């Protein structure tokens, strides 16, 4: 199956009972047992397993070429359960440019649980080897990062984590399974902030986790059931529904990203454009070796904070909001960050250009 056919028929998204071509929304909490312990189709309690949630988990497991899938109530919940794979005294290595909520949870919550953290500039693989302490048990890397889009070598990070006995995790939210598959590069666990691209319509807060390891999946299934950060059935369906058009959406976003960047590099009011597609970008060639596409998040710099406030008000199609990966374009100041939507490419380039022209 090619990529666009996998997004439609990958996993189990139909009902074998009635033949429904979409997954039924099992808004239920419990299931009848014919005999004591005799499950009709393997469901006993919705927290342990829910057929609508099991559908979206089989979709992300296929899109990432994994064996097991896990749906959580948010991208932060999916990252929490992954960190709970370690005990008191264990050490984690993350990239210095992690997303803010990851920095918060690990430095404010899990440090209170004995988990020691150390943020490392992973753009140079040599800095990962040296920081590995005897208690180091995990390697967590996002690529490209937020909001400067720093690229980390996934393959080398996997070989590093393997040699030193580390659980390799990759936050693949920005790249999506359509352009990047960390599991195929040796990574143990891959997770996504499903609120971003997989949902794609700014209407689901969710997280997904995929892995080919039976152990880590067994330990993750126990953590999910024992911590209950599960995704609801309604949100699970809308996630499946939005994933169906993931390929078409990313290709339209990729087409606009190319044209928008060309505009940003030539404007006199824009210094420092940040995106892995730019040639002068650090680790640019590494990104192309591990990905066959590009993310829709772009970051550029204006003169000062007042110019960024003026640029946003002059736009007509960019929505001032705090997410990314939507069908509608989003803009925010973490330096300005934009999440390219699926509007007309000529309209998005012209709207941002005429807004920058007013500076």
């Amino acid at each position: 199956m090619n990529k666009k056919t996998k997004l439609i028929h990958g996993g189990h998204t139909t009902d074998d009972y009635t033949g429904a071509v979409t997954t039924p929304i099992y808004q239920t909490s419990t299931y009848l047992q014919d005999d004591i312990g005799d499950l009709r189709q393997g469901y006993e309690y919705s927290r342990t397993a829910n057929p609508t949630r099991s559908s979206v988990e089989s979709v992300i497991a296929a899109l990432e070429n994994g064996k097991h899938g896990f749906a959580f109530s948010s991208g932060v919940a999916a990252i929490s359960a992954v960190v709970m794979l370690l005990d008191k005294g264990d050490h984690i290595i993350l990239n210095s440019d992690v997303y803010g909520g990851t920095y918060r949870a690990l430095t404010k919550v899990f440090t209170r649980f004995g988990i020691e953290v150390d943020f490392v500039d992973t753009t140079h693989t040599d800095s990962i080897v040296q920081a590995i302490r005897p208690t180091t048990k995990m390697l967590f890397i996002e690529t490209p990062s937020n909001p400067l889009l720093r690229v980390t070598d996934i393959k080398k990070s996997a070989e590093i984590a393997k040699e030193h006995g580390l659980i390799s995790v990759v936050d693949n939210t920005f790249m999506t399974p359509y352009y990047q598959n960390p599991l195929d590069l040796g990574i143990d666990i891959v997770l996504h902030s499903a609120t971003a691209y997989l949902g794609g319509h700014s209407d689901v807060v969710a997280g997904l986790v995929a892995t080919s390891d039976d152990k880590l999946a067994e330990r993750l299934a126990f953590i999910s059931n024992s911590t209950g950060g599960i995704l609801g059935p309604q949100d699970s369906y809308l996630l499946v529904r939005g994933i169906k058009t993931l390929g078409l959406r990313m290709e339209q976003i990729n087409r606009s990203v190319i044209e928008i960047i060309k505009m940003l590099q030539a404007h006199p009011a824009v210094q420092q454009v940040f995106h892995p597609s730019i040639e002068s970008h650090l680790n640019h060639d590494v990104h192309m070796a591990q990905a066959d596409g590009h993310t829709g998040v772009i970051a550029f710099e204006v003169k000062n904070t007042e110019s960024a406030k003026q640029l946003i008000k002059a736009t007509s199609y960019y929505t001032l909001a705090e997410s990314l990966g939507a069908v509608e374009s989003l803009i925010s100041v973490p330096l300005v960050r934009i999440s390219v939507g699926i509007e007309d490419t000529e309209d998005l380039v012209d709207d941002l250009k005429q807004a920058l022209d007013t500076l």
Copy 2:
């Protein structure tokens, strides 16, 4: 407002915009900002705050006479966030008869995070005083417990936790806010497995947390945002919808519970009926002093495991399932445990009696 009027108009369950008499389902992830940092109605990101989730949080805060509410993706998620209020080395005291999932999360997950646990027979308040270590920081009690319905003195446990400087938590799932208000008895934090009675229709997996403490609410809001165990908007609405009939449902369940127990105590095939309403029940008078009602979970003993298997098959209205607090009656063997539904009282008594008669 009396109890039945509070369940309808307590909290904020209407739309001030359109005037809609029910809370809109905000299936959304982000919100437009008029200016940088200028929130229209105080919403910026659905994980931090969602209007549908804020509605159900204001309902549970009012029903428990609390000041702040928190909705989580499951009852286990609500209990996890409460445990994350403590750091490495802190100690918790729980009742020896806690629910299984609470035993799992604390002994298999949080012990790996330095949190030391000790389960204590809380039915005698003297056993709580002696176990308080210098590192003890929390007192967690369910009353009545699962599945033997052991009653713990809430008021005395609150005075104990206050004197020794402890965060008092009460799992009020079985009693619901309609019959028991732990906050009114001095308890710091109250939580519920909203999957049970508050939802009431076996279609929402959720947890709720209420507290009158501004500190603990601030620390809980940070934990919820930093761990992302949030409840979805669709599940939040169905929770609000089911809570509307909580009073009518509990009163029907209470009427049947009285008649079912009278039947169970007189049947020759039933030894040892467990419920706080029985006079010979341990701490029976304590339960009536802290609650003006009764739970619908009843536990009784048959001769052996084969008689329990036979009793379940002979029933017609009791559903063999793994939850509780549903409109439909539920039965399970953890000794048999039944969750009384809202069916006709004469039908539920007769159905269970004719099934026990076959033993």
Copy 3:
């Protein structure tokens, strides 16, 4: 064999035979796979024709009304439209004089162009029904108790009249609900509901329901529903199933407050007339009590004028000034003269609902 409260929980099929789920799965779908051409896995081919979630609520209303076939529509008016479509050009319908405004609107502004000629009759006296039967009469439609004056019509006699003259008897059982009044058991052919009112019960679903035991009329209704497509969505179908579960407890609480609220209205000096079937002096009070074992939560009363009715509504705290009825929250409205107020008793505390309306009437 099941009592009413148990029938509301286990009546019909509201579980999943596949996974075992204790609630009806929401089949948000449009079409269904066929293993072989013409072979349906479980009898579904297109959601408009049949949907598993809609089929659940259809079996519920069929069991609650002691009928064989149930039909769910997009709204109460859609259920009335589909029933009126049972008739041909030139046919005649007899309706009660004070039928709901929307039905009056549909029958006199839309279906008068179908060729159906409508007649509105004081059905409280069954003789007026016999006197109005024209040769080309084919259907008898009656609302009991009506809106907003709650006039009571003899259902059993109306069924015998329709049978005697070969008419299709239809009863709008919205106000009474299947928990208190079963027209099908009294000889009526078709019973319909505005599920927006009490069956939904939480003021969050706009739906219509139809039930009948006649196989011929059911096939004709299934054809019209598929040929006109006023079907109910799967999400609304499930919420309707969910709300029906608490129907008995909701009505029993509403009836308790109805008794105390009426007593307050009869003793207040700013209230003149009170309209409700439970009142002994109400016309056909014995008829209602013989065909129903309960009372609706809609009450109509009169104040001095329109300014008094306006000030009353602003003086209440638990009565929501809005349309619709039968919700868990109490509703108030002014529909028929200026001073005629109409309330929909919710499930709030009885003492709170009586004290709030009593003090509000006292600022007059």
Copy 4:
């Protein structure tokens, strides 16, 4: 000023002005509080009359079709019913000869009793339309391209004919979608859709949509919708809004596969005739290309007989044997002769959809 792909994202009102939410809130409600009697906070009083979530999808289809007023119905047939109700007893309707089966069913088995007399015409030759106009003719209904043979009718000429003879022109634009064909811009009075097909796009919503710029006809449609209640639920309204967001990318991918799939069908020896407007030899191929800048994803072709059509469907791997069309997944069916197969090209990979149908046709 917006291009098509930007219009699909920001056209109409699909945000919450209150909280600022970037999507339409699902107003699962039935009634609305009134501060003062008759004072509406935001113009809502009863969900059947108007619902905020339904009003969102109504403004979407009105903007996509360059119309002023939009209406959402419970299904595509409900949208057709409400439009046919615009006419009175005795009025006449002219429809294309190969109109959809459900419309044929509704117009010849239900509305023939309304007093409406229906006429089915070969609208591919506009002269047949003029020849059929009776004195009592009031409406012109046309499907282009039709189903399943995809016959193309001149929309611009059909609008001039309706205007010349004082008829209400209606175009079923389901197959073409507003992304490729805008009948209102060509002089048509009313355009309707079966949103179950492409607008929803994910085979999970049964809905109908109507759009018009005529103020008089819009008030008449709003009245019929309220007086018959075939409205769309709030949950289905939102999913319809959500699915429309990706309409352009879905159709553009469907069209790319349509080009390659047709070329394969024209060169396969087990395939005789292929029916699609893009084919140069197709009747009125120049007409379609002049009134639309795209192509539908429904393709019709012929195999040797019925056994060959049965074996073909069992031989595919990505084509789902089911009803409906326009979904993200490819669909197949056998409707008109035995060997006539009808496919609905999905958004799967073009190479995968061409190779899967090519190898399946090769086992014949």
